[PDB]
Structure formats: C-alpha cells, structure tokens
Amino acid sequence: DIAGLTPCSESKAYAKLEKKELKTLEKRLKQYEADSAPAVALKATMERTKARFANYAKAGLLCGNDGLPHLIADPGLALKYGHAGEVFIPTFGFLYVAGYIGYVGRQYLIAVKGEAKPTDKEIIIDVPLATKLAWQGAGWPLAAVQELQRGTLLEKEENITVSPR
Amino acid sequence: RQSWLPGSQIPAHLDTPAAQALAGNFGFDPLGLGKDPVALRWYQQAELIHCRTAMAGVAGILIPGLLTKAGALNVPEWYDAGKVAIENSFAPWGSLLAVQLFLCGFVEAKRWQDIRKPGSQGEPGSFLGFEASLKGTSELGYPGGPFDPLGLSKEADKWADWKLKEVKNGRLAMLAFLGFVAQKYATGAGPVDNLAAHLKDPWHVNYATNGVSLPFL
Amino acid sequence: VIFIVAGHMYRTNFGIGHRMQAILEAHTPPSGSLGAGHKGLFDTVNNSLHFQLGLALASVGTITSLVAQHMYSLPP
Amino acid sequence: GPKRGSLVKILRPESYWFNQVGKVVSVDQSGVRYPVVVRFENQNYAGVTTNNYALDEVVAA
Amino acid sequence: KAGNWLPGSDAPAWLPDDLPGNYGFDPLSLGKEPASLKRFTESEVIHGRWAMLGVAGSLAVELLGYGNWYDAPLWAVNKATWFGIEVPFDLNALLAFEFVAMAAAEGQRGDAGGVVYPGGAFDPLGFAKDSSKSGELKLKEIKNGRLAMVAFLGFVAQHAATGKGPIAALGEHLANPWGANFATNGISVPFF
Amino acid sequence: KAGNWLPGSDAPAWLPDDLPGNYGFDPLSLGKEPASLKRFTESEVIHGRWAMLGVAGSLAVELLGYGNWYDAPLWAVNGGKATWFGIEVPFDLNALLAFEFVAMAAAEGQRGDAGGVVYPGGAFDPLGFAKDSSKSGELKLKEIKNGRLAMVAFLGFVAQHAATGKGPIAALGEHLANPWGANFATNGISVPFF
Amino acid sequence: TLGLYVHNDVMQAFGTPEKQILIEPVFAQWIQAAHGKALYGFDFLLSSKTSAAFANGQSLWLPGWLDAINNNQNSL
Amino acid sequence: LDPQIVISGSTAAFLAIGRFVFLGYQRREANIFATNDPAGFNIIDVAGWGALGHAVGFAVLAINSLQG
Ligand code: CLA
Ligand code: CLA
Ligand code: CLA
Ligand code: CLA
Ligand code: CLA
Ligand SMILES: CC1=C[C@H](O)CC(C)(C)[C@H]1/C=C/C(C)=C/C=C/C(C)=C/C=C/C=C(C)/C=C/C=C(C)/C=C/C1=C(C)C[C@H](O)CC1(C)C
Ligand SMILES: CC1=C[C@H](O)CC(C)(C)[C@H]1/C=C/C(C)=C/C=C/C(C)=C/C=C/C=C(C)/C=C/C=C(C)/C=C/C1=C(C)C[C@H](O)CC1(C)C
Ligand SMILES: CC1=C[C@H](O)CC(C)(C)[C@H]1/C=C/C(C)=C/C=C/C(C)=C/C=C/C=C(C)/C=C/C=C(C)/C=C/C1=C(C)C[C@H](O)CC1(C)C
Ligand SMILES: CC1=C(/C=C/C(C)=C/C=C/C(C)=C/C=C/C=C(C)/C=C/C=C(C)/C=C/C2=C(C)CCCC2(C)C)C(C)(C)CCC1
C-alpha cells in the first residue's frame, strides 16, 4: 500500500508475532492448575492479546517486514487512504487539551494579578476561582481567536529587555 | 425575566440593553463566549445562519420522510438521498459541489461584507439594480427588500414575536439535525422509523437499550 | 570554467567590475522590513577579522559535513 | 518631577526594571544627581526593590 | 397611473404618475432609488420588445408548420431553413455574424444614456409626433410587452412540462379541457 | 477610480484615483511605496501587452489549423522544419535564438534606456488615437482591462494544458459538448478529492 | 523524541512490540522516490517512466543513476 | 559545422549589442584610459563583451555537437 507496506491483516509476520506471543503465554500457562488464579490471570492475558491483535487488524493499520504497525504522518495521504485516526485526529485532540491547560493557566494568572497578593494566590491556590476557570475553559479556541483579533492576546513592547535589545 | 435556569445568576454580558433586545435571550452563556460584544455580534449572526439552514435542512428531512410513509412521494432515506439523486442526476457530484461553492461563495461574501460594514452593499454603481435593495433593515442579520417579499416584517407590534418564534424553531431544528445524525449512527434506521419504534414500545426501545449511547449499563 | 568566469566579477584596476559596498548599500528592501538593510556592513566585515573568521569557519564546517555525507554515499 | 505615590516608567537601559512600572517615594530637591526614589513590587537579583533614578530616566506613565 | 395591481392597497410614493404602466406594483421596493428605477424602466421596455418578437416568432413558426420554437436549433445541435427554403450557413458563422451585428447595434444603443423611446429612423411612419397618443401607445406597448413576457415564460414552462408546442398543447386543452391542463401533467402539482 | 473590486470596502489611500484600472485592489499592500508602485504600473502594462499578443497568437494558431500553442516549438524539440501560415521558414533553432536575442536585446535596451516611459506615442502611435488627452484615459483603461483579461486567459491556457493536456479551443469544444461531465472538477487534477 | 523511545522501550520490555509507536518517514521516502527509487511506490518525477525530467535526462546520465540508486547493496 | 561562422557571428553580435544598447547602462552602473572611439568603448569593454561572445558561441557549438 503506502511506502510498500502491506496491511497488517494481510501481513504474515503479524500473524507469526501473534502466534509467537500466544506460544510464550501458553508455555507459561501449562505449568499450573485450571481454576487457580495464575491460570485465570494468564487466560485473561491471552484474551487481551487476541483482542489487541484483532483490533489492530480491524483498524486497517499498515505493517512492515517485521509485522509491526506503522503510522502515517501526512494529512493528505492519511485522509486519502483512511489513516486520519492515527496522527491527524490525535494531533487535533492533543491541541485541544493542551490549549485547554494553557488557557486555564493564563486566565488564572490574569485573575490573580489583579489583587494585593498575586504571589500568595500563586502559592495557595484559590480553588473556587480555579475550578470556575477550569469549567469555563471549554470555549478556549473561540476565546483565543477572539482575544487574538482584539489585540489583547499580546503584550506590547513594555516588556523587559536587555541593554543590547 | 425568563432564564434557562431559575436561580442561577445571569452573566453580566447577557444583561445589557444590547443583549436583552436581541432575540431568545435566556441568559445561557456558561462558557462565557459572548463577553466580547464584537464576538456576541458575530455569534448572533452565526446562530441566525445555523438556525435558518437547520430549519430548511430538517424540513427537507421530515416532510419527505413523513410523506413517504403515506402514499405519495417515494423518497429515499436522508442518508441515501445523495446517492439516489446522483444516480438520477446528470452531473458528477464534484462538478455540482464546485458550482454550489461558487454560487454560495458569492452570496456568502455579500453577507460577510454586510457583517463587516452594515451600510456596505448599497454602493451606488456597484450593482446593476440590486444595489438599492441590498442594504440592511437597521438590524443586522434581518435584511429587507427581495428577502421577505410578503411584508410580514412591516408591522412593529408583531416583530419581536416573529424574531422569537424564529430563534426557538431554529434552535429546535438544530437539536433535530444533531438527533438525525446521532440516531442514524446508533440505530441504523430513519428518524420516522425511530419515532414509530418509540411509539410502538416506549419502555423498551430507547437510547438506554440501543447498546451504544451508554455502554456501561 | 564556472569559477574562472565568476572570478571576473569584482572591480579591480580595470574600470569594469562590481563594487561590493555599492551592492550592499543597494540591497535594502522597501517598507523598512529589514530597516537599513545591509547598510554599513562592508566596513564591518572588512575591518573585523572575527566576522571573516566566523564566516569562513561556518562555510568550511558545512562543507566538511558535505564531504562526509557525499563521500560515504558517492564513493569516488 | 513627579509627585509622591505616582506611577512612572523606567527608561534607564541597564536597570533591572527598565521598560517597567514602579512607584515614586520622593524626589529630592537638592543638587543630587539621581533624586527620584522609585519602589518596585518585584525584587531584582540582589533582592532590592528600590532604586534612585534621574529626571530623564522616569516617565510618568 | 394605469390602474391598481391590487385594489385597496396604496401606490408607492416613488413611482410617478406620468409613466407607462404604473399600476403601482412594487412589493420588493426594488425601484425606490431613481437611478435603479431609470435602469429598470429601460430594461422593462427592452425585455418587452424582445419578448413580443420572440412570441410572435414562435407563433409564426408553429402556425406556418415547420416545427415549434424548440425544433428550430435541432439541425445545429446535430441544415438550416427559413420559410422552408434552406439557408447555406453553419453554427460558427451564424454566431460570428450575430455577435458582430448585435455588438454593433447594442453598442450604439448603449452609448446613448437614457433613450427608451428614440424615434427618428426607428420611427419611419411618424406615429409619435403628437405627445399624447404616443403616450397612450407607450401604455399599450408596455402592456403588450408584459403579456408577451408572461407568454414566453409560459411557453418555456409548458414545454418543460409536456414536451410539446404551445399550439399543439392548446389543441389538447380545446379537445380535452378537464383532461389536459397543468395537472394531468404530473409535474406542476407533484401529488396524485 | 475604475470601480470597486469588493463593494463597500474602502480604497487604499496609496492608489491614486486618476490611474487606469484603479479598482482599489491591493489586499497584500504591495504598492504602498511610490517607487515600487511606479514600477508595478510599468510592469502591469508591459505584462498585459505581452499576454494580449500571446493569447492572440495561441487563438490564431489553433483556430486556423496549425496545432495548439504547445505543438508550435515541437519542430525544434524534435528534428523538423518551421512553418508559418503553412509557409516554411528556412531557419534553425540556433539561428532563430540569435535573431531573437539581438532583436529583443536592442528593443528592450532602448525601452529600458528611457526613464519611466509607459505610453510613448510618436512612432509607436502612428494612427494618432492618443493625441486627444481626454479619451486617452478611457483608452488606457480599456488597455489595462483587456490586458488583465489576457493575463488571466494565458494562465488559464497554461493551467488547462497542465491538467487536461489539450488546446484551449478543444477544451472549449469539450466544455460545450458536456459542460457538467467535462470541467476542472471532472478533471481529476485540480481538486484531488472529487 | 525521548517520549517515543521510552514508550517503545516499555513496549519491548512488556513483551508487546506491536504496540510501539512507529512513525513512517514518508517525507524522506517521497524525496527518495523523487530521486528515482522504486521501492516506496510513489512513482513520480524520476521513478515514473512517463515524466518530463525522466525522459529528458534519460538519454545521457540517468541510466547509471537509476541502476545505482535501485541497487540496495550500496550507501546511495 | 561552421565554427568560424558561429564564433565570429556570436562575438560580433555580443560586441555590437554591448557597443550600441548596453554601453550607456554600463556607464550608468559603473559610476585603457583613452581611446579614439566616440563612446569610450575601450580595450577592456572589448575584452568583456568578446568574452561573452566567445563563451556563448562555444556553448552553441557544443550543444549543436551534442545535437540536443
Ligand atoms: C510538513 C511538511 C509536509 C511535507 C513534506 C508533505 C509531503 C507531502 N504531501 Mg502533505 N500536507 C501537509 C504537510 C506536508 N506534506 C500539511 C500541513 C497539509 C494540510 C495543509 C498537507 C495536505 C496535503 C494534501 C491534500 C496532499 C498532500 C500530499 C503530500 C505528498 C506529495 C506533495 C508534495 O510533494 O509537496 C510537498 C509538501 C509541501 C511543500 C508542504 C505543504 C503541503 C501543501 C499545503 C499541500 C500539498 C498538496 C499537493 C499540492 C498535492 C499534490 C498532488 C499529488 C498527487 C501530485 C507529499 C508526501 C498529496 C498526496 O497525497 O500525495 C500522494 C496530497 O494530495 N499534503
Ligand atoms: C423582465 C424584466 C422586468 C423589469 C426590469 C421590470 C421593471 C419594472 N416593472 Mg415590470 N413586469 C414584468 C417584467 C419586468 N418589469 C413582467 C413580466 C410583468 C407581468 C407579470 C410585469 C408587470 C408589472 C406591473 C403591473 C408593474 C410593473 C412595474 C415595473 C417597474 C417598477 C418595479 C421595480 O422597481 O422592480 C424592478 C423589476 C425587476 C428588477 C424585475 C427583474 C426580475 C426579478 C429580479 C426576478 C423575477 C423572477 C420571476 C418572479 C420569476 C417568475 C417565475 C414564475 C414561474 C412564478 C420597473 C420599471 C410597475 C410600473 O410602474 O411599470 C413601469 C408596475 O406597476 N411590472
Ligand atoms: C399568458 C397567459 C397564459 C395562457 C393564455 C396560457 C394557456 C395555457 N397554458 Mg400556460 N403558462 C403560463 C401562461 C399562460 N398559459 C405561465 C405564466 C406559466 C408558468 C407558470 C405557464 C405554465 C404552463 C404549464 C406547466 C402548462 C400550461 C398549459 C396551458 C394550456 C392549458 C390551460 C392551463 O392549464 O394553463 C395554465 C394555468 C396557469 C399557468 C395559471 C394562470 C396564470 C396566468 C399567467 C394568469 C394570467 C391569465 C389571464 C388573467 C387570463 C388569460 C388571458 C389570456 C386570454 C391572454 C393553455 C393553452 C398546460 C398545457 O400544456 O395544456 C395541455 C400545461 O401543462 N401553462
Ligand atoms: C503580473 C503583473 C502585474 C503587476 C506588476 C500588477 C500591478 C498592479 N496592479 Mg494588477 N492585476 C494583474 C497583474 C499585475 N498587476 C492581473 C493578472 C489582474 C487580474 C487578476 C490584476 C487585477 C488588478 C486590479 C483589479 C487592480 C490591480 C491594481 C494594480 C496596482 C496596485 C496593486 C499592487 O501594488 O500589487 C502589485 C502586483 C504584483 C506584485 C503582481 C505580481 C504577482 C504576485 C506577486 C504573485 C501572484 C501569483 C499568482 C496569483 C499565482 C497564480 C497560481 C494559479 C495556479 C492560481 C499595481 C500597478 C490596482 C490598480 O490600482 O490598478 C492599476 C487594482 O485596483 N490589478
Ligand atoms: C479567462 C477566463 C477563463 C475562461 C473563459 C476559461 C474556460 C474554461 N476553462 Mg479555464 N482556467 C482559467 C481561466 C478561464 N478558463 C484560469 C484563470 C485557470 C487557472 C486557475 C484555468 C485553469 C483551468 C483548468 C485546470 C481547466 C480549465 C477548464 C476550462 C473549460 C471548462 C470550464 C471550467 O471548469 O473552468 C475552470 C474555472 C475556473 C478556473 C474559474 C474561472 C474564474 C475566472 C477566471 C474569473 C473571471 C470570470 C468572469 C467573472 C466571467 C468569465 C469571463 C469570460 C467569459 C471572458 C472552459 C473552456 C477545464 C477544461 O479543460 O475543460 C475541458 C479544466 O480542466 N481551466
Ligand atoms: C450556546 C452555547 C453557549 C455556551 O456558552 C456554551 C455552549 C453550551 C457550548 C453553547 C452551546 C452550543 C450548542 C449546543 C451548539 C449546537 C449546535 C447545533 C446542534 C448545530 C446544528 C446545526 C445543524 C445544521 C446547520 C444542519 C443543517 C442540515 C442540513 C442543511 C441538511 C441537509 C440535507 C438534507 C436536507 C437532506 C439530504 O438528503 C442530506 C443533507 C445534505 C444532509
Ligand atoms: C415587476 C417586479 C417588481 C417587484 O418589485 C418584484 C418582482 C415581483 C420580482 C418583479 C417582477 C418581475 C417579473 C414578473 C419578471 C418576469 C420577467 C419575464 C417573464 C421575462 C421574460 C422575458 C422573455 C424574453 C425577453 C424572451 C425573448 C424570447 C426570444 C427573443 C425568443 C427567441 C426564439 C425564437 C423567436 C424561436 C426560436 O426557435 C428560438 C428562440 C431563440 C427561443
Ligand atoms: C494585483 C495584486 C495585488 C495584490 O496586492 C496581491 C496579489 C493578489 C497577489 C496581486 C495579484 C497578482 C496576479 C493576479 C498576478 C497574475 C499575473 C499573471 C497571470 C501574469 C501573466 C502574464 C502572462 C504573460 C505575460 C504571457 C505571455 C505569453 C506569451 C508571450 C505567449 C507566447 C507564445 C505564443 C504566442 C504561442 C506559442 O506557441 C508559444 C508561446 C511562446 C508560449
Ligand atoms: C575599430 C572599428 C571597427 C572594427 C572593429 C572590430 C573588427 C572589432 C573586433 C573585436 C574583437 C574580435 C574582439 C574579440 C574579443 C575576444 C575575446 C576577448 C575573447 C575571449 C575569449 C574567451 C574569454 C574564451 C574563453 C574560453 C576558453 C579559453 C576555453 C573554452 C571556454 C571559453 C569559451 C570560456 C568597425 C569597423 C566596426 C567600426 C570602425 C572602428
């Protein structure tokens, strides 16, 4: 398919690796009882192994010569061959939660600078104000692009600068 | 006044004359998106456009979907109508989408420049004869002239009532379209079929039983 | 041939040729997006040996990387 | 120069609080070279929050 | 004022009385502005004259019996004819002559600013040298022109419905009136 | 001012009103500095005139039956002989490049020796249409509008041949034969996901 | 970079190599296909036989370059 | 081919073009010591423009020898 990679459900080293992990787990399994808790834990392990290999073969991942899933990081090639779930949807999910954390921290900083003890509200966290901003932070991309377009996202050149500049 | 929660405090940006005079004001901004008045103007416009296209869309779902259960109008399911129509059609869907992108982009840019400047699309000379009938009607998002032919917006004693009926039917049609998408992914049948199943057995056929919407139970 | 042709660019005692200070004073873009541009850089490259030494070391180091990368891959 | 308690802006370039805002304590009226006493709510690397400045190093902003 | 398009309703204050065809019909208020209204009076008279010519032409073609107005470019979608006599030209040459002649005539018309009723060599018989009967004929002209615009849109919609010419569809409406109209169509009213 | 490229938006304050083609179109603010703007007026008129002659050449080659504008240097790409209205031209590619280099270097150099001459007149204007100074602005406006349309048309020629691979007259024949089944969205190149 | 290496080390330690994050270098493989390497199947500009660059350089210097770049027994 | 014709014509073309249309631009941009020429087209101008002539002429001869 992409880059000479076969799909994992078509790959043979993928099936060999699945069979090898089952072989190691059953060689460890064959030295216990039946209803014993080590045997129960190893059968749960084998169930999770089979479920994991079936889910990775179901998700349409691409395997190499080693039988291991390879990820495709190109928006157009991923959206063309059905691989947006591995890099593209995770990167927009990450950027949503990372801007969430950063915007809630920025709103807490701006809220606590407007008092007579900003360092005291930085050492001892104002929990109601922090939870208020943490719930209100869900509209952070809209609020961020609005603060961008008003010219209030950015401080002017009243910043601290060195002698050189 | 009326609110989405009795006893909750109304946000201070939704309690001003400019916000209370809008339409459908119930004090619902818990995420604080409309604290900026320019943002609230832009979001008023975005709500009006999503309301009107959601009503037109959900009417195109329901009325053929209701009448296809009666005798006339053998209309396919709304998640199959694009395929059935493009088999019936003459053009490929890419060319049809390109034509609708140009034709919508013209009109959209007209609305965009009206949002930027209210007295904008009435430049004398810029249109052949459109230019006289393409100003606003002193309230942005509510144009006049060729839009609204029948003159229903002429009597002032009906005007807030027409506004509030529009914003309620629009929000309810947006809920209806999100429902159409959700039910389609969950059940696999049409929305009239979902309504017939909830009427045939309400206490056993719902979203608590479909095995998708809450899978912990 | 390319280096011999490129070695007739600059103005020695023969009338023809380019003047480096003139080239540097000319390449300043409009709108002030680079400010004064390359104004006054000839008297700061010419008078400083550490600027010339840093330029020479940057070029020779990048070329030494080029030598290694091209000699493993294209063995002469 | 500026009166007591008013906010100024420091333009001495090698100051720690250059391009920032402090508060005037007093202005000495002798022939002292740096009479404007400004306090700052943050400390420098020496842990000092107060410095003398000149009349052309402070701007009432 | 030629009348009232809806009795009881009032006339708009932007349409003057000394204008050919002033029934007061302006619901969308498209001509509240004078430059727009001037351009639309020009466009209304020009559309009316072209539609009179087109309706008279389609009637003449179908009554004289050489097909309808829809069969006339079928040789060129694929030899031309006129009065049954074949005409020795091709589509590209016809488009060339038509583009040159209409560009010349239209361009001479567009050089004049607000000329709607030119006279002169356009008016050889001199009916409009009285300034009163000329205005009554202006009113007759705008009424005939609106009627022919409605007639031509009826031709287009009627052919898109039935696939036949207007005289043949009029023959159907005279033969079976309660069995041949826009409702045995199956298109104009989608039910039944 | 010629018109307004986007109605209701204000014109940039650096574009003077008495200039041919002034629709107020400068989103990227490329002409805010006057010497740059003078050079862009010169270059806009020159590019427009070259594109007019190029589009007229491509049309006149393909309508008269001598291949398209892309088949015209193929006698020199391959081993062949030149032709012009069917009449052969007894020259080779090196000789023609010599003639073109000498001629264009002379003409271009004489044009560049002039300071800012865009509308010279005199020998360039033998029939004397711009000897009026009142219809001259209207003719310059017509000149810059036909030139912009010709630039857009020649970039259309290039992009259409890059995508479909035919001449513009044959592409117009396909677009008249099937306007919905033959366009840049039935292309397969211009929009990749259609 | 450290997080991906530590992630893959935890996967290799816990006996599960099929869970480790293995991003494919599709940009540099695209560049190698542009250079004429028919391994990754992009097939463009020097790897496609119907290309202008391929057809113009094909008579004189490309037949050695293609053999040397499609040999997997060298560092080219 | 015709090497004398190609080299002599290329050198003549480049010397004529630098003598007649690029001389004034070269005198504007530059701002042995005395010649009879009314434009000051000296030995070094002859050397530069004839160098361009010989270079372009041998390039044309080499491309035509490759037949490309
Ligand atoms: C980080 C840099 C980067 C690089 C090196 C690539 C590399 C690639 N892109 Mg990707 N792309 C990227 C980021 C990048 N992309 C981003 C950020 C977007 C969203 C804007 C895209 C959206 C995108 C689309 C829709 C497509 C590609 C495609 C490609 C492949 C061929 C195009 C090419 O060689 O252009 C070099 C890349 C750049 C100069 C980076 C800018 C990318 C622009 C914005 C899009 C380029 C698309 C291109 C015009 C389509 C060519 C069609 C192809 C069949 C010839 C190549 C592997 C095409 C493909 O699927 O090939 C099989 C394709 O259709 N890309
Ligand atoms: C063909 C174009 C056309 C144009 C430019 C005009 C222009 C005018 N009309 Mg006329 N009119 C027309 C056709 C036209 N008319 C037709 C066909 C009829 C018979 C139905 C009439 C019947 C009529 C009456 C009774 C009166 C006018 C009047 C006017 C004047 C004022 C109205 C105005 O300002 O709007 C400008 C008009 C337009 C911009 C029309 C352009 C087309 C619009 C934008 C879309 C129409 C689409 C149409 C509804 C589709 C029908 C489909 C069908 C299946 C339902 C103006 C000069 C008034 C007047 O004072 O007379 C001079 C008046 O009293 N008109
Ligand atoms: C100009 C006036 C006019 C006249 C005399 C006719 C006459 C006719 N039409 Mg046509 N038609 C017209 C305009 C007209 N039409 C317009 C404007 C449209 C687009 C809406 C159509 C679309 C149309 C279709 C789809 C069909 C017809 C058909 C017919 C024929 C059957 C009767 C019928 O059902 O009419 C249709 C009735 C209307 C369109 C409603 C009337 C609206 C008009 C414009 C009001 C003015 C009429 C006037 C007050 C009284 C008549 C004046 C006249 C004597 C000059 C009949 C010959 C049918 C046919 O083919 O018969 C076999 C048919 O299927 N017409
Ligand atoms: C190609 C040369 C060229 C040049 C030098 C100019 C220069 C000018 N134009 Mg003109 N213009 C051009 C082409 C050009 N134009 C074309 C082809 C059109 C039709 C689309 C126009 C339509 C136009 C309008 C409506 C107006 C102007 C105006 C102006 C003047 C001020 C604007 C400015 O400063 O931008 C400087 C311009 C450039 C630097 C052009 C260079 C091209 C840029 C850098 C990149 C373009 C890339 C291209 C879009 C890629 C296409 C890829 C394709 C596959 C899609 C300036 C004299 C304004 C004016 O007052 O008229 C005198 C004005 O109102 N132009
Ligand atoms: C100068 C005007 C112009 C005209 C009349 C045409 C006409 C055509 N083009 Mg071309 N083309 C143009 C410019 C033009 N193009 C430009 C600027 C580009 C680069 C973006 C292209 C790139 C291109 C490609 C890749 C293809 C075509 C194709 C075609 C044909 C099918 C229609 C289509 O899908 O076009 C494409 C539509 C556009 C590029 C949008 C046009 C936007 C214009 C320039 C804005 C101004 C238009 C103006 C408002 C009204 C038209 C004026 C005109 C009548 C004089 C049709 C004959 C297709 C073909 O070969 O069919 C067989 C095809 O595959 N064109
Ligand atoms: C207010 C607020 C505030 C605070 O602060 C915060 C928060 C809470 C966050 C917020 C909220 C929000 C929300 C809820 C939202 C939602 C929305 C929606 C639902 C939309 C839809 C929307 C929707 C829409 C538009 C839709 C539309 C539709 C359409 C057109 C359709 C179409 C169609 C049809 C006809 C048919 C065919 O066959 C197909 C189709 C094509 C499909
Ligand atoms: C007034 C007003 C006002 C308010 O304010 C608003 C409103 C209401 C909107 C408005 C209204 C409007 C309207 C009604 C419109 C309509 C129009 C029309 C119908 C036109 C036609 C129009 C039409 C026309 C011109 C036509 C023309 C035609 C022609 C030439 C034809 C031709 C032909 C012929 C011979 C035959 C052949 O075989 C072919 C052809 C080629 C086909
Ligand atoms: C204005 C502005 C402003 C703002 O600020 C910004 C922006 C927007 C960016 C801008 C825009 C721009 C643009 C649009 C541009 C475009 C251009 C073009 C297209 C050019 C062409 C241009 C073009 C041209 C010259 C062309 C020319 C051509 C030619 C000569 C041709 C020739 C030929 C012929 C005959 C045929 C044969 O077989 C071959 C050949 C040899 C091929
Ligand atoms: C006086 C006179 C005259 C005459 C003139 C003449 C005849 C001139 C000539 C001149 C000449 C005749 C010059 C020449 C020059 C040349 C040169 C200066 C050369 C150089 C060369 C080179 C530099 C080369 C190089 C190379 C080599 C060695 C190898 C291979 C590569 C190459 C090619 C790069 C006349 C009659 C007109 C007029 C009167 C005056």
Automatic annotation (TrEMBL), chain B:
Chlorophyll b 4 binds at K83, Q100. All-trans-violaxanthin binds at D29, L31, W78. Chlorophyll a 14 binds at E166. Chlorophyll a 21 binds at V212. Coiled coil: none annotated. Chlorophyll a 10 binds at G144, E166. Chlorophyll b 3 binds at K83, L134. GO terms for cellular component: chloroplast thylakoid membrane; photosystem I; photosystem II. Chlorophyll b 2 binds at R52. Chlorophyll a 2 binds at W4, F28. Chlorophyll a 13 binds at K165, N169. It comes from the Eukaryota. Chlorophyll a 22 binds at S213. Chlorophyll b 1 binds at W4, R52. GO terms for molecular function: chlorophyll binding. Pfam families: Chloroa_b-bind. Chlorophyll a 1 binds at W4, E47, H50, K165, E166, N169, R171, Q183, H198. Chlorophyll a 7 binds at E108. Chlorophyll a 15 binds at N169. Chlorophyll a 18 binds at H198. Chlorophyll a 5 binds at W42, H50. The light-harvesting complex (LHC) functions as a light receptor, it captures and delivers excitation energy to photosystems with which it is closely associated. Belongs to the light-harvesting chlorophyll a/b-binding (LHC) protein family. This is Chlorophyll a-b binding protein, chloroplastic. It comes from Chlamydomonas reinhardtii. The gene is LhcI-4.
From TrEMBL, chain E:
Its main location: membrane. Chlorophyll a binds at E44, H47, K140, E141, R146, Q158, H173. GO terms for cellular component: chloroplast thylakoid membrane; photosystem I; photosystem II. It is found in: Membrane; Plastid, Chloroplast thylakoid membrane. It is a multi-pass membrane protein. InterPro entries: Chloro_AB-bd_pln, Chloroa_b-bind. One of its GO terms (biological process) is photosynthesis, light harvesting. This is Chlorophyll a-b binding protein, chloroplastic.
